[PDB]
Ligand binder design. Sequence first.
Ligand code: AR6
Ligand code: 7M9
Ligand code: ZN
Length: 282
Amino acid sequence: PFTADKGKCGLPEIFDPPEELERKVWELARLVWQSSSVVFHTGAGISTASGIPDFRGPHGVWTMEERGLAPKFDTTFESARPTQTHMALVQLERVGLLRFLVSQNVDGLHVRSGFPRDKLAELHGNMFVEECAKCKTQYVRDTVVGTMGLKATGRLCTVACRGELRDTILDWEDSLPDRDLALADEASRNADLSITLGTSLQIRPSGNLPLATKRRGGRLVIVNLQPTKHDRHADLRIHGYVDEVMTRLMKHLGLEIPAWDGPRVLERALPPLPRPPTPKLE
Ligand SMILES: Nc1ncnc2c1ncn2[C@@H]1O[C@H](COP(=O)(O)OP(=O)(O)OC[C@H]2O[C@H](O)[C@H](O)[C@@H]2O)[C@@H](O)[C@H]1O
Ligand SMILES: Oc1ccc2ccccc2c1-c1nc2ccccc2n2cccc12
Ligand SMILES: [Zn+2]
């Protein structure tokens, strides 16, 4: 709990220089174009450009704690805006290029960005979500739910039930949600491309799921400023800021990154929108 293993923290950052970075994002476009089933895995580094520190970055929560310093937030969770990366994931799902979204983040931003909850697994919980112990109904709130560790929040279930409502923030000892894990695992297994964004992949089983894509010939892309636990298994590793990678990628793919209306919850994925025709890849 206090000696929970926080892994390797504050490893040096890598910057692919510009021409190498262009070449690798073109190759990622290539693989997106060639794949039948793309699953994206996200961690805390997709939210740093919205003011939320990561865990193991140079100024991450655990990194800073190791040296005696505090992490720094430049927003609240309620006032955080989804990044260019978050919104690029919203679009890729709408046009049928993303089959499933696995996230370790609890920051609420994927849900708030409008991303459909039935294509999303929130492996570590979501701080805006509470869950009824009795019927299992979830409530996506507009403010962070006061507690962590699957505790009672003090509110009751309003289903047509009075069950105790609890947070969904897993503690060190707490097993992952079975639904979310089972769907992330299925998705990961059947995917032919897994792309990891802003995770150092050190937590298991979250960080292992991208490797499942390797099983039957799947390709694995890792996008991260630091080294990650599975770098050697990656077919491509792109060392850059994820917003810069994603914006380049979308431009190659011929897609706009859509506008954020403010916080919205979408339960179920809408019907898929038209998307550009695919280039010839010789
Ligand atoms: N803007 C950026 N662009 C690219 N990479 C980034 C950026 N900012 C940060 N990174 C990289 O982002 C990576 C973020 O890695 P970690 O900080 O381990 O977060 P996790 O999501 O995998 O943490 C897993 C869980 O562990 C915790 O205990 C909680 O339970 C978490 O749910 C770093 O390697 C950064 O270099
Ligand atoms: O619990 C969350 C939840 C979400 C986050 C998002 C970004 C960065 C840190 C956190 C944290 C984190 N967790 C802590 C757990 C135990 C002790 C201190 C923690 N901590 C301090 C600041 C942020 C956090
Ligand atoms: Zn209930």
